[PDB]
Write a protein that binds this DNA or RNA. Structure first.
Ligand code: K
Ligand code: K
Ligand code: K
Ligand code: K
Ligand code: K
Ligand code: MG
Ligand code: MG
Ligand code: MG
Ligand code: MG
Ligand code: MG
Ligand code: MG
Ligand code: MG
Ligand code: MG
Ligand code: MG
Ligand code: MG
Ligand code: MG
Ligand code: MG
Ligand code: MG
Lengths: 78, 116, 117, 177, 52, 135
RNA sequence: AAAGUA
RNA sequence: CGCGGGGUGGAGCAGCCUGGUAGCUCGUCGGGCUUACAACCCGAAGGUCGUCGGUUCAAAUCCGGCCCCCGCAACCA
RNA sequence: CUCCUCCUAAAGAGUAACGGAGGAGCACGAAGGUUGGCUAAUCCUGGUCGGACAUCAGGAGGUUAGUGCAAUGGCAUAAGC
């Protein structure tokens, strides 16, 4: 006999690229994600594939804010 | 609920203004009165304010809940803001339509000198 | 052209038009017209309202339309729940006035029902 | 307007004495009257919906709104978005005039009429009734009708229960049985 | 793959064209859009034509 | 023979069987048969023990089965070499020490002990007789 | 032109 | 076991592909022609499509199992 | 036999097998941009034809809906209408 399985897709290398406290340059990707598990905070942008990236030089900061206890990433100016 | 509906209506623009770090000119309208505040970018400090519940403004109006009162409040808030030296704000309609009394207030503030 | 809660034809003679009421036949229609003082051969289209209103109370003198239907239904229901011979005939849909059932009786029995196998 | 004045000038005090309300704002009010036609045969001939809408417009003195299917239903061969009804919402003066017309003219002209059911309340003081034939409304000419058509009438009331709803309706001499 | 390629040709006479696709069975009407012509450096009308 | 009426998936990874059990108290009856060992209980075993118990008490009292065979087990047929996972052949419950497997009520303790001994003789895992505790 | 049986 | 094709009025066979009640012939039933039967003529009825699940607003139909049947293949040492 | 989604995969990434399960080889000039507005499923009760299920009204409920098409991650400030 044979199997009807045997397929998969290539790994997409998502996840956090710069962790809390890391110094980054403007433009740096901070996290790659499907949809907004993390949300964009101060000095952070959200791209068309929901990548969060730095809009200014500084240090990465994660926090939980708002009425829904959501996770936000911001850049602290250094 | 009307109030919750209006708050939902206003949230997107308010979050955009906070992200932009703008100084807000927030308007609040009731059937009897209209109010205006100029709020610092942190969202928790009021720089200037003017409304029809103030005696100095309400004493010169036949009725505090119409377009003439709205224009008076807009002019007063713009004059006080210019006296404080602000000159640059973003209008926050707070979920009310940009129309009627709200629009008359905004037009009066623009005429008096606020840039928005 | 509105008597006893229904609409009567306007292009017909009064005597013919009145029979459209449930509970009014030719004889009762003739009696009602005689009581109202209206000719039988006059179309109700050319009748003034002052004649329709005098026809209406004459019609109301009788038991017609919904009242008559309720009365007939009540009498048949009384037979059925009494369970006499006539009531059983009404229950089973067979003729109730002693007609033959070996043949005929199609009005009471409906169309023919062929035997299955 | 006549029935509105009648309400404000007798019904308020009648209901206040009957139910011992502490405020006039507690008195049940007639919020709205909604007329509906479920024209499920328009899927075969949409012109039937047009005729039904014309009849509703004649009856209520208002332009009706065509209502579409909320979802596809296999049982009735309708897809989502199919226009299958028409409704009219009456408030204020139009509501009061229609209420007066319905109470004093149309309801007595109902075939074999013997009073409206007092159990046609939804539990929160709103009333619903069904008119089998539109010809009871004098605005509809019996000679020009191409097809008999019924409708549903709902009176939505600010009452809190069926007893208060029926008291308010009976204060207008509603023809209950 | 029923959609066919088409070009949108500048009305400014420059020869500039954009390309896109179209469902020709459902929308037989010609596509017409205002788009930027980089030759004359203005937005102008562009009209559908065959792909080549 | 217990077996899920339906399942999300037909086949399951082998997995492992570490830890102590949850559900170590007589919770429904007065007496219980508790596992002391670790292992798998097939649906056939569960049912063989149930039969032994029930006939011992003459269908008096009440009996609960606290375990359910929800894990499918596949086998490869004879004379087959790979080529995909084998076919589901039976169903098991994973058992850890401390698991109460059956409970009884409405019978004397001596009879319950006898019935449970007859049942344990059908099972591949060591067991012990337990009684309800107040706390 | 087509007419089998008892 | 592997690869295919199937299962639909009493029988043989369409429709299935491509989602919106399914047909033909023989057969059966009632009537007619005949002294009677056959042949012949007229009229009528009879299946929710092998069994379950899933998708779907909707399944004879698409998908996934299960049962029965048919045809190939199941080999080198 | 190329591509996508989950699991295996051992809480960063990556990670094999003729391992376990499903999909793609498009669609859309609006189903794209923006401004303004809006909020679901399901059930209960009352209501002409109307029925288990059509449209109407009220209530409960709170996203159990929705997303052009798999699955995962998302989505109310909606990315849903
Ligand atoms: K007889
Ligand atoms: K005869
Ligand atoms: K109410
Ligand atoms: K993983
Ligand atoms: K758009
Ligand atoms: Mg993957
Ligand atoms: Mg008569
Ligand atoms: Mg493990
Ligand atoms: Mg465990
Ligand atoms: Mg012979
Ligand atoms: Mg050879
Ligand atoms: Mg990992
Ligand atoms: Mg790891
Ligand atoms: Mg490696
Ligand atoms: Mg490797
Ligand atoms: Mg692999
Ligand atoms: Mg494939
Ligand atoms: Mg918007």
């Amino acid at each position: 006999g044979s199997t009807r399985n045997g397929r998969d897709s290539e790994a997409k290398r998502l996840g956090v690229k710069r962790f809390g406290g890391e110094s980054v340059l403007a433009g740096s990707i901070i996290v790659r994600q499907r949809g907004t598990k993390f949300h964009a905070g101060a000095n952070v942008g959200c791209g068309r594939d929901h990548t969060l990236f730095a809009k200014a030089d500084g240090k990465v900061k994660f926090e939980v804010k708002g009425p829904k206890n959501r996770k936000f990433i911001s850049i602290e100016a250094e | 609920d009307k109030k919750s509906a209006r708050i939902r209506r206003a949230t997107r623009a308010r979050r955009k203004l906070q992200e932009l770090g703008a100084t807000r000119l927030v308007v609040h309208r009731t059937p009897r009165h209209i109010y205006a505040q100029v709020i610092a970018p942190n969202g928790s400090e009021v720089l200037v304010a003017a409304s029809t519940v103030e005696k100095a403004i309400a004493e010169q109006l036949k009725y505090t809940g119409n377009k003439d009162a709205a224009a008076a409040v807009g002019k007063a808030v713009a004059e006080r803001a210019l006296e404080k030296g602000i000159k640059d704000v973003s209008f926050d309609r707070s979920g009310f339509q940009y129309h009627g009394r709200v629009q008359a207030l905004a037009d009066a503030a623009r005429e008096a000198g606020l840039q928005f | 052209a509105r008597i006893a809660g229904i609409n009567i034809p306007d292009h017909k003679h009064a005597v013919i038009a009145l029979t459209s009421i449930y509970g009014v036949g030719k004889t009762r229609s003739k009696a009602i017209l005689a009581a109202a003082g209206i000719a039988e051969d006059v179309k109700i289209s050319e009748l003034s309202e002052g004649q329709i209103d005098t026809l209406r109370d004459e019609v109301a003198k009788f038991v017609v339309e919904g009242d008559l239907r309720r009365e007939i239904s009540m009498s048949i229901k009384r037979l059925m729940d009494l369970g006499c011979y006539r009531g059983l005939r009404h229950r089973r849909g067979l003729p109730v006035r002693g007609q033959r059932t070996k043949t005929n009786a199609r009005t009471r029995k409906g169309p023919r029902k062929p035997i299955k196998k | 307007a006549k029935l509105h004045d009648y309400y404000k000038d007798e019904v308020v005090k009648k209901l206040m004495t009957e139910f011992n309300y502490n405020s006039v704002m507690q008195v049940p009010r007639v919020e709205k009257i909604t007329l509906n036609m479920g024209v499920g045969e328009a899927i075969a001939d949409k012109k039937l919906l047009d005729n039904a809408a014309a009849d509703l417009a004649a009856i209520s003195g208002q332009k009706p709104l065509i209502t579409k299917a909320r979802k596809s239903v296999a049982g009735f061969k309708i897809r989502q978005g199919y226009p299958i009804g028409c409704k009219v919402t009456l408030r204020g003066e139009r509501m009061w005039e229609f209420f007066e017309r319905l109470i004093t003219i149309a309801v007595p002209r109902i075939r074999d009429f013997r009073g409206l059911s007092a159990k046609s309340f939804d539990g929160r003081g709103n009333y619903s009734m069904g008119v089998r034939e539109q010809i009871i409304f004098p605005e509809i000419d019996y000679d020009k009708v191409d097809r008999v058509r019924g409708l549903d009438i709902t009176i939505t009331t600010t009452a809190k229960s069926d007893e208060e709803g029926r008291a308010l309706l009976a204060a207008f001499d509603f023809p209950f049985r | 793959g029923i959609r066919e390629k088409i070009k949108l040709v500048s009305s400014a006479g420059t020869g500039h064209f954009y390309t896109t696709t179209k469902n020709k069975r459902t929308k037989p009407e010609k596509l017409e859009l205002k788009k930027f012509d980089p030759v004359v450096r203005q937005h102008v009308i562009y009209k559908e034509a065959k792909i080549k | 023979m217990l077996q899920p009426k339906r399942t999300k998936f037909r086949k399951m990874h082998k997995g492992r069987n570490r830890g102590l059990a949850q559900g170590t108290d007589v919770s429904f009856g007065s007496f219980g048969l508790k596992a002391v060992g670790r292992g798998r209980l097939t649906a056939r075993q569960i049912e063989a023990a149930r039969r032994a118990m029930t006939r011992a008490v003459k269908r008096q009292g009440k009996i609960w089965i606290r375990v359910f065979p929800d894990k499918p087990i596949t086998e490869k047929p004879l004379a087959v070499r790979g080529k995909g996972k084998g076919n589901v052949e039976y169903w098991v419950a994973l058992i850890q020490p401390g698991k109460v497997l059956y409970e009884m009520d409405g019978v004397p303790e001596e009879l319950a002990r006898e019935a449970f001994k007859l049942a344990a003789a059908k099972l591949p895992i060591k067991t012990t007789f337990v009684t309800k505790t107040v706390m």
